[PDB]
From Swiss-Prot, chains A, C, E:
Family the UniProt entry places it in: Belongs to the CRISPR-associated Csm2 family.
Keyword field: Antiviral defense, RNA-binding
GO BP annotation list: defense response to virus
Function, as annotated: CRISPR (clustered regularly interspaced short palindromic repeat) is an adaptive immune system that provides protection against mobile genetic elements (viruses, transposable elements and conjugative plasmids). CRISPR clusters contain spacers, sequences complementary to antecedent mobile elements, and target invading nucleic acids. CRISPR clusters are transcribed and processed into CRISPR RNA (crRNA). Csm functions as a non-specific ssDNase. Base-pairing between crRNA and target RNA to form a ternary Csm complex activates a ssDNase activity; target RNA cleavage suppresses the ssDNase, a temporal control that prevents uncontrolled DNA degradation. Viral RNA transcripts probably tether the Csm complex to the viral genome, recruiting Cas10 ssDNA activity which is able to degrade DNA in the transcription bubble, spatially controlling the DNase activity.
Keyword Disulfide bond among record annotations: no
Entry protein name: CRISPR system Cms protein Csm2
One Pfam match: Csm2_III-A
NCBIfam families: cas_TM1810_Csm2 (TIGR01870)
Subunit annotation: Part of the Csm effector complex that includes at least Cas10(1), Csm2(3), Csm3(5), Csm4(1), Csm5(1) and mature crRNA. The Csm complex is elongated and slightly twisted with a maximal length of 215 Angstroms and a diameter of 75-80 Angstroms. It has been modeled to have a central protein filamant of Csm3 subunits along which the dsRNA helix of paired crRNA and target RNA binds. The filament is capped at one end by Cas10 and Csm4 and at the other end by Csm5; ssDNA is thought to bind to the N-terminal HD domain of Cas10.
Highest classification ranks of the organism: Bacteria, Bacillati, Bacillota, Bacilli, Lactobacillales
Native source organism of the sequence: Streptococcus thermophilus
Keyword RNA-binding listed: yes
From Swiss-Prot, chains B, D:
Cofactor remark from the record: Endonucleolytic cleavage of target ssRNA by the Csm complex requires a divalent metal ion; Mg(2+) has the best activity in vitro, but Mn(2+), Ca(2+), Zn(2+), Ni(2+), and Co(2+) also support cleavage.
Subunit structure: Part of the Csm effector complex that includes at least Cas10(1), Csm2(3), Csm3(5), Csm4(1), Csm5(1) and mature crRNA. The Csm complex is elongated and slightly twisted with a maximal length of 215 Angstroms and a diameter of 75-80 Angstroms. It has been modeled to have a central protein filamant of Csm3 subunits along which the dsRNA helix of paired crRNA and target RNA binds. The filament is capped at one end by Cas10 and Csm4 and at the other end by Csm5; ssDNA is thought to bind to the N-terminal HD domain of Cas10.
Family, as annotated: Belongs to the CRISPR-associated Csm3 family.
Enzyme class, first EC level, given as a word: hydrolase
Domain of life: Bacteria
Impact upon substituting residue 18 to A: Wild-type degradation of target ssRNA by the Csm complex
Descriptive protein name: CRISPR system Cms endoribonuclease Csm3
Annotated organism of origin: Streptococcus thermophilus
Length: 108, 212, 108, 212, 108
RNA sequence: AAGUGAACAGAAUUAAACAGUUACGAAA
RNA sequence: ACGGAAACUUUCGUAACUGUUUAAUUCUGUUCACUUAUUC
C-alpha cells in the first residue's frame, strides 16, 4: 500500500524532474473531491463522476511525456477496474497520496 | 455621518478582451486559454480582482511624487482609497467593487448566437521560418453590458474631504476607458467604456450632488 | 459506456493516423457547448440547436475519408434519435469524450 | 506628466484582402477558410493582432543593428514600443491598438451592394497537366474604411524623446501602405492606405504638436 | 425538419447523379447570406433581397432539367409564401442544409 | 451538352508556480 | 439516615489589511477556373 511507494517511485531515469506540482492540478482535483463525497450518499448513485475519473488518466496521458511513464509504472489504470464497492474505493483514494509525498522529497 | 453611496454604472465592452481563468481545472476543454465563467451556469462573469489592481496601477502613476517600489506603499492621497497593509492609521479602504455579471441576456438570445465565448486562432513568426506553433486563444462577445456597483462609504470623520475624493474616482474611471482591461490586451482587445454613470443613495444619510 | 469504447476505437485498419485532434474541432465544438447549457434551462426551449447538431455529423461525413469510417463503427447517428429528454442528452455528451481521449492514447 | 495621445485615422482599403479566421468554426457557411467577422453582427471586422505582428516585422528590418532570430529581442530603439520578454527594466508596451470596425456601412448600401463577402474562383495549374485541385477563396469588399484608434501614453520619465517617437510611428504607418496586410496577400490583395492621419489629446496633459 | 429529409432526398431515380457541387454555386449563396444578415437589422428593411430570392427559383429553374425535379420534390416554392416574419425565415434557412449535407452522404 | 472531390508540416511554448507587519487581551 | 449536601471553565472576538494568470506573438509558405472551337 504505502511501503512499495518509496522504491517504485524513486526508480526512474534521468534526474532533475521538470514536472512540479502545478502542472498536475487537473488529474489530482477529482481524487480529493471523491473520498469526501462517497461517504455521505451511496456508491450506486454517483454514476457520472466514476466514468469521468478514468477519462482524466487517458486524455492527459498522450500530451505530456511525464505522465505516461508514471501511469504504466504505478499501475493506475489497473486499479480502476478492480474497484466496485464504496469500501474498496476508499483504499484507492489513499494510494494516490503516496505518489505525491515521496515525489516532492527527492526534488519538487 | 455614515452613508452608503452606490455608483451604479454599465460597463459596455467596445472590444472583446480576454481573461485568464482557472487552467487545468475545468472539463475536457481546458485548452485554448480557458476563460473563467459562472460556477453554476454558463454566463461569463468578470472578476473583481482585475479591476481593483488595474485602477490602482493607473492611479499610482500620475497622482504621486515617488516611484512605487512595493505595493501598499505609494504616496498617501490614494492609499486610503484602496487600502494599506503597512500603515497603522487606516486599514480598511473606502472602495468596494463587485463581480459583475453579463446582464445582456435579455436581448442576446433574440439575435440567435452560437455560444457565449468563441475561439480565435493566432500564431507567431520566428523571423527565420514561416508558420510555427499554431496556438489558439479564447475571447468574449462585443457590446455587452455589466451591472457594476461601486460601494462607497465614509468614516464620518473623513467628511471634509468628500468633494476631493469625487474628482479622483471620476478621473480613474475615465482614464481606464483608454486602456486595456483583463489580459492579453496589447494587441487591442481591452479598452472598456463606462455607460450610464450615475449615483444614488441606499442607506440615506448624505445628499445627492454628483452624477456624471 | 467507457468499457466498450477502448476496444472498438482501437480496431481500425492501417496504422499512423493522419487525422489529429485539431481538424475535428468543428463537430466537437457544439457538443461541448451544449452540455453546459442544457443543465441550466429546459430542453424544450432550445429547438434550433438540436436539429443543427445532427447536420454536423452528415455534412462533415462526405468531405473527409477519416470521418465516415468512424461514424459507421461507433454508431453516432443511431444515438441521435434515441435521445429526447434532457437527462438522456447528458449521457451522450459523456460518451463523446471517449472518442477523443482514447484516440490520442495510441498516437495522436 | 501622464498624457493620453490618440492617433485617430481611417484605414482605407484600396484593394480587397483576405484574413484567415477561425478554421472549422463558423455558422452556415464554412467553405474555403471562413473569414472572421463580428460575434454579434455580420460586418467583417479586422483583428488587431495582425496590425502588431506586421508593423513590428517591417520596422525591425530597417531600424536595427543586428539580425533578429526570436521575438522580443531585436535592437533596443523599438523594444520599448511593443514589449520585451527578457528585459527587466520595462515589460508593458506604450502602444495600444484597437479592433477597427467598418464605419462605412452608413453609405455603402446607397451605392447598391449585394453582400459583404464573395467567393473568388482561384485555382492552380500543375504545369505538367491541365487543371488540378480547383480550390477557391473568400474575399471581402473593396474601397472600405475602418475607424482605427491608436492609444499612446508616456511614463513621465519618457519625455526627453517624445519627438523621436513621432517620426517612428509616422514612418511605420506610411511603410505599411506599400505592403499587403492580413494573409496570402502575395497576389495583390492587401495594400492598405491610412487616410486622415491626425492626433488629438483626450486626457489633456500634453500640447498638440503634430497634425499631418 | 431533418427526419423527413433523409428519406425524401434518397428516393430519386437512376443512380450516378450528374448534378455535382459546381452547378449549385449560385442558389446556395443567397440563402447562406440571409440567415446571418436577418438577425442584425429588422425584416421590414431588407426588401430588395427577399423578392430577389424567389426569382432565382424561377429563371434558373428552366435552364436545366436537373433543377426543376429537385424543387418540386423538396417543395421550395411553397415555403417562400408562408414566411413573413424574421423568426419564420430563420427556420427555412436551416432546412437548406438538409439538401446539401444528405446529398453527399450517398455519393457527392 | 463537356473528370470539377483546397493540397501538404508544427496542434500553444520559453520566465516566474505562498512573498510579509504577527499571535490566551483583563477576574478567581 | 453516605467526606457526603450546595456549583455552566463561563462572558469576551470576521484567520485579517495591500495584489491585472500574465509578459513576448501576421492561420499562412507555393498557386492562370481550364486543354480543344470559322453564328453561318
Amino acid at each position: 500500500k504505502a511501503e512499495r511507494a518509496i522504491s517504485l517511485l524513486e526508480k526512474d531515469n534521468k534526474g532533475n524532474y521538470l514536472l512540479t506540482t502545478s502542472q498536475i492540478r487537473k488529474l489530482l482535483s477529482l481524487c480529493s473531491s471523491l473520498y469526501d463525497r462517497s461517504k455521505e450518499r451511496k456508491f450506486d448513485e454517483l454514476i457520472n463522476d466514476v466514468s469521468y475519473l478514468r477519462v482524466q488518466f487517458v486524455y492527459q496521458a498522450g500530451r505530456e511525456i511525464a505522465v505516461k511513464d508514471l501511469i504504466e509504472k504505478a499501475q493506475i489504470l489497473e486499479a480502476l477496474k478492480e474497484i466496485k464497492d464504496r469500501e474498496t474505493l476508499q483504499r484507492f483514494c489513499r494510494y494516490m497520496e503516496a505518489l505525491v509525498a515521496y515525489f516532492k522529497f527527492y526534488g519538487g | 455621518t455614515f452613508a452608503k453611496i452606490k455608483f451604479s454604472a454599465q460597463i459596455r465592452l467596445e472590444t472583446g478582451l480576454h481573461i485568464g481563468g482557472s487552467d487545468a481545472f475545468a472539463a475536457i476543454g481546458a485548452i485554448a486559454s480557458p476563460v473563467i465563467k459562472d460556477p453554476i451556469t454558463n454566463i461569463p462573469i468578470i472578476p473583481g480582482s482585475s479591476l481593483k489592481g488595474k485602477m490602482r496601477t493607473l492611479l499610482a502613476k500620475v497622482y504621486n511624487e515617488k516611484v512605487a517600489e512595493k505595493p501598499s506603499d505609494d504616496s498617501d492621497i490614494l492609499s486610503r482609497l484602496f487600502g494599506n497593509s503597512k500603515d497603522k492609521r487606516f486599514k480598511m479602504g473606502r472602495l468596494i467593487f463587485r463581480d459583475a455579471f453579463l446582464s445582456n441576456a435579455d436581448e442576446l438570445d433574440s439575435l440567435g448566437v452560437r455560444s457565449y465565448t468563441e475561439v480565435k486562432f493566432e500564431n507567431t513568426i520566428d523571423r527565420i521560418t514561416a508558420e510555427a506553433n499554431p496556438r489558439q486563444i479564447e475571447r468574449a462577445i462585443r457590446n455587452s453590458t455589466f451591472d457594476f456597483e461601486l460601494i462607497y462609504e465614509i468614516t464620518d470623520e473623513n467628511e471634509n474631504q468628500v468633494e476631493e475624493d469625487f474628482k479622483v474616482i471620476r478621473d480613474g474611471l475615465k482614464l481606464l476607458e483608454l486602456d486595456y482591461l483583463g489580459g492579453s490586451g496589447s494587441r487591442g482587445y481591452g479598452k472598456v467604456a463606462f455607460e450610464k454613470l450615475k449615483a444614488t443613495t441606499v442607506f440615506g444619510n448624505y445628499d445627492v450632488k454628483t452624477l456624471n
